[PDB]
Paper text:
The valine was changed to alanine, isoleucine, or leucine (V72A/I/L), and the tyrosine was changed to phenylalanine (Y162F). The mutation of the cross-link tyrosine to a phenylalanine was found to have little effect on the active site and global protein structure of R2lox, although the hydrogen bond to the carbonyl oxygen of V72 is missing in the reduced state and the cross-link cannot be formed upon oxidation. Interestingly, in the structure of the aerobically reconstituted protein, only one of the two subunits of the dimer in the asymmetric unit of the crystals is in the oxidized state conformation. Very weak difference density for the oxidized conformation in the other subunit suggested that the reduced state conformation was present in at least 90% of this molecule (not shown). This asymmetric behavior might be caused by different packing interactions of the two molecules in the crystal. It should be noted, however, that other mutants that crystallized in the same space group (V72A/L-R2lox) did not display large differences between the two subunits. It appears, therefore, that the asymmetry is caused by the Y162F mutation, either because O2 activation is partially impaired in Y162F-R2lox, or because one subunit is more sensitive to X-ray photoreduction during diffraction data collection, an effect previously observed in a related class Ib R2 protein. No impairment of O2 reduction could be observed in Y162F-R2lox in solution. This suggests that enhanced sensitivity to photoreduction was the reason for the reduced state conformation that is prevalent in one of the two subunits of the oxidized state Y162F-R2lox crystal structure (see above). Like the wild-type, the Y162F and V72A mutants assemble mostly (Mn/Fe)III/FeIII cofactors, suggesting that in the absence of cross-link formation, putative metal(IV) species formed after full O2 reduction are partially reduced by external electron sources.
A related group of proteins with a similar Mn/Fe cofactor is termed R2-like ligand-binding oxidases (R2lox). Following O2 activation, their cofactor catalyzes a two-electron redox reaction which results in the formation of a tyrosine–valine ether cross-link in the protein. The tyrosine and valine residues are conserved in the R2lox group, and the cross-link was observed in both R2lox proteins that have been structurally characterized. Both proteins also comprise a hydrophobic channel leading to the metal cofactor wherein a long-chain fatty acid molecule is found, which coordinates at the Mn/Fe ions of the cofactor. The mixed-metal cofactor in R2lox self-assembles with the manganese ion in metal-binding site 1 and the iron ion in site 2 if both MnII and FeII are available.
Author numbering:
A (entry chain A): 3 to 286
B (entry chain B): 3 to 250, 263 to 286
Write the structure that this text describes.
Amino acid sequence: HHDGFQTVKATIDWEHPMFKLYEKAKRNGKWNPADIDFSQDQKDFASLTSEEKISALPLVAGFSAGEEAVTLDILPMAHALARQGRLEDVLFLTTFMHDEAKHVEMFSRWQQAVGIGQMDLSVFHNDHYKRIFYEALPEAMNRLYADDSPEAVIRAATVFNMIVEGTLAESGYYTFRQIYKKAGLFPGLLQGIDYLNMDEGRHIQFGIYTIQRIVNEDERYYELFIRYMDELWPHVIGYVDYLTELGKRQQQLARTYALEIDYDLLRHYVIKQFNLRKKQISRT
Amino acid sequence: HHDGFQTVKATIDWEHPMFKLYEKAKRNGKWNPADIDFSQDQKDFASLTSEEKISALPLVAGFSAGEEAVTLDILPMAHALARQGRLEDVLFLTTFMHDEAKHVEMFSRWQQAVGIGQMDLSVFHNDHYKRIFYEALPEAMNRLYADDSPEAVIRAATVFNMIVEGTLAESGYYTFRQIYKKAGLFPGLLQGIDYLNMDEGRHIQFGIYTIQRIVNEDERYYELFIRYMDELWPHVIGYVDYLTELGKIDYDLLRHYVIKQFNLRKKQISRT
Ligand SMILES: CCCCCCCCCCCCCCCC(=O)O
Ligand SMILES: CCCCCCCCCCCCCCCC(=O)O
Ligand SMILES: [Fe+3]
Ligand SMILES: [Fe+3]
Ligand SMILES: [Mn+2]
Ligand SMILES: [Mn+2]
Ligand SMILES: [Mn+3]
Ligand SMILES: [Mn+3]
């Protein structure tokens, strides 16, 4: 039951950081995946050899499942904050959810347009990827239906916003640009990547706000955060190593397009992102 | 756990009715409550007598609580459909949820602008309103976390989409236009109502689609729909009567519009 309603007894808290983020989302999130022109992407894909064609799919496979996972797995967070009466957070989470729906749609339209919609891309999820996206992420979010303690909320935000989004998605955006933007390939996809990357900034800021407000109540939670980050790292780097090793074995795309794909710089960016995320949370 | 992902094994079902409605929501859902100019609404409200001021509040009280209730109480429906693998429904429900947030925002911005944000409008919720919005609606949706059976889904969609939205919300939009548009009062608010009414068409289409696809499996479910509609009518009309009595504008025309919406919603569901 509802005991009352905030906007009947009072108003929205207009100065709440999440209401301000919600207003930014409305202003900055108007893009529509249906408006992206993928016609040149289709031509680029068909111009590639079977061997070059496969070079690009592992990354798209990771994103496509990732967007879908987070579309579904953000609902428990919105439920738990709704039950705590955090209306401004809930308002913002509606934009977060609608962003992720558009992200799922974007990568699925690209797959459809380039002619791989019928291909099962699951073969590029190794065991580390599944640990995070098939298991740890849904376990941490679904927990919130029965356990919305600060410990549970920190853990959900950490897996979802600081690892999945703040570490893996950010490094994927960077990787796309280092490879495909340099090569001049897939302009529709990269347009979408740029929209995603802009949306993502708000998603990570929600996670920072959520973790920090819990850490502000009791310093002890800061060490929970750092520990949950470190618990997930081996799967992060285990997925990244797997992508890196696939890429090192399919060098035709880089040759054809004259790219020196520094896979060690990419791996260093993942490590940098991970430690950046850790540092955006303060003990006090 | 996730067994796999539809957009990795395959793609979105591009032809699915709820993917189509999602596409229409993105195209038609761009409005922003923050762009509405409420400055004249403030002047209009200040120029009313104390008695005319309090005449306006009950309806706004009903809407502001109602938008907040549906923003929160749609989440179990999104979860239950997500859990059933209905990805296109979920994509649509993200637009549904973001619409209701903008609706909460619009009425709260209006209360703030005209200077009643500090006032507690709960006094204008009678027992019948609380039965629907404080109790029956969250009960029926929250049930879906543990019981997503066809019977529970039809009950949730009936209470939410056919009664709260299809009967009360539609009637309230009609009421606002009949009273205030003929009076040249609250033009910001009425612009917001026009946007809300456009959004609400899709929300009702979702409810119809949901109830009808469950009825198509078994006609027994048609009779459950009609029964649950009738179960709620006494509270719908109890609330409408309470509002009508406060106003005492052709109030019997409004009252009959509510009955007209109620029967229209029944008719939009086919036994077969
Ligand atoms: C070759 C270097 C590897 C770089 C690492 C790339 C990681 C791929 C990204 C897949 C996960 C995407 C998750 C989306 C999350 C969201 O939208 O919130
Ligand atoms: C005086 C005649 C009475 C007319 C009926 C007025 C009913 C007021 C409406 C309040 C409930 C609004 C529910 C919001 C649901 C939504 O927008 O999805
Ligand atoms: Fe995200
Ligand atoms: Fe609605
Ligand atoms: Mn390993
Ligand atoms: Mn009564
Ligand atoms: Mn995303
Ligand atoms: Mn509404």
